[PDB]
Amino acid sequence: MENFQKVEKIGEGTYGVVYKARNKLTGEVVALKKIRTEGVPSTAIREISLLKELNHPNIVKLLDVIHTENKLYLVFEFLHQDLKKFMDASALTGIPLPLIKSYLFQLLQGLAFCHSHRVLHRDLKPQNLLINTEGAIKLADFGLARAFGVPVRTYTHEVVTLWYRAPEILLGCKYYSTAVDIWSLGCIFAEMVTRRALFPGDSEIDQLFRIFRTLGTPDEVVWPGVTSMPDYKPSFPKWARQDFSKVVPPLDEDGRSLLSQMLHYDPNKRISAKAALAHPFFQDVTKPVPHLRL
């Protein structure tokens, strides 16, 4: 805008371009997101505005929502790096388990908070998990999906990742629950551990089948109601479930146990963020500081 000073382009978001900017007045450095559109649904304005009150240490703070010239700018707290960049940078030696655990623990606190205030993320991915030099990790873009539907592309040619999408979403369920975020986080947890995406689908069906090939094709036994879901097809191949120890080696049994509960097919059986925080996997949780090259 005019009150800022575009420091640099932080890239293209899932709605619009994002700039690192400095408030000419407060002097604070922020992340400015330009959201796609001819008028901007006031329903979305109200929704988005409610999020300015969703404040938690593990949630990227939404500082301001500015609707002007029928344009929508979201002003966010700035963090220097995202988990996707950090995982790539740690790819050779992998992120230490104490840090993986700290991050997972903080992310779960963030989800617990959001979920208790009835706010879902719906599109969690390494790219929207931001970290700082103090060992903190925070969830970015919470609640935006609900206030901006679900578009195939960002808004202008760009393939949205399906890798972290919950199976109920892929089977066409129309009502999402807090469980979709636990699923995405489980996928992210597995990726930090193995240093490779758990389910790197390149199409919705490839995503679904990759999930099926690893966790077994779901049936009425493990997921009551699954065969009645909108996109379920009796013709889906039936793959047997793979041993978990083969999925995220060499994670210990505490870790494997928690991951398995975060990846339960039935959204209802899937562990909640609150319950997850009490899992024995976090018994020795600490807050290490990462090695960040900025």
Ligand X SMILES: NC(=O)c1cc([N+](=O)[O-])ccc1NCc1ccccn1
Residues numbered 33-62 forming contacts with ligand X, rule: CB under 6 A: 33, 60
CB of 284 to ligand X, least distance (A): 29
Residues 6+ apart with CB under 8 A from 251: 193, 259
| Secondary structure (3-state) at 81 | strand
Under a CB-based contact definition with an 8 Å cutoff, are residues 258 and 275 in contact?
Answer: no
Token output for 6: 């575009």
> Is 123 tagged catalytic?
yes
The reply to whether 13 sits near ligand X by the rule CB under 6 A is yes
**Chain residue at closest Cβ approach to ligand X:** 31
> Residue type for 70, please?
N
Residue from 1, 5, 10, 36 binding ligand X (CB under 6 A)? 10
In the 8-state DSSP scheme, what is residue 169? H
Residues 6+ apart with CB under 8 A from 158: 12
Per-residue contact track with ligand X, 58 to 97, x per CB under 6 A? Answer: --x---------------x-xxxxx---------------
250-275 per-residue burial string, b: 16 or more CB within 10 A, e: under 16: ebeeebbbbbebbbbbebeebbbbee
The reply to whether 31 sits near ligand X by the rule CB under 6 A is yes
CB of 76 to ligand X, least distance (A): 4
The reply to whether 191 sits near ligand X by the rule CB under 6 A is no
For residue 57, count CB atoms less than 10 angstroms from its CB and return exposed for 0-12, middle for 13-18, buried for 19 or more.
exposed
Piece of 9-17, 51-59, 113-121, 248-256 that binds ligand X (CB under 6 A): 9-17
The reply to whether 189 sits near ligand X by the rule CB under 6 A is no
Per-residue contact track with ligand X, 119 to 158, x per CB under 6 A? Answer: -----------x---------x------------------
| Secondary structure (3-state) at 271 | coil
Chain residues binding ligand X by CB under 6 A are 10-11, 13, 18, 20, 31, 33, 60, 76, 78-82, 130, 140
Binding residues for ATP: 10-18, 33, 77-79, 82, 125-128, 141
Catalytically annotated residues? 123
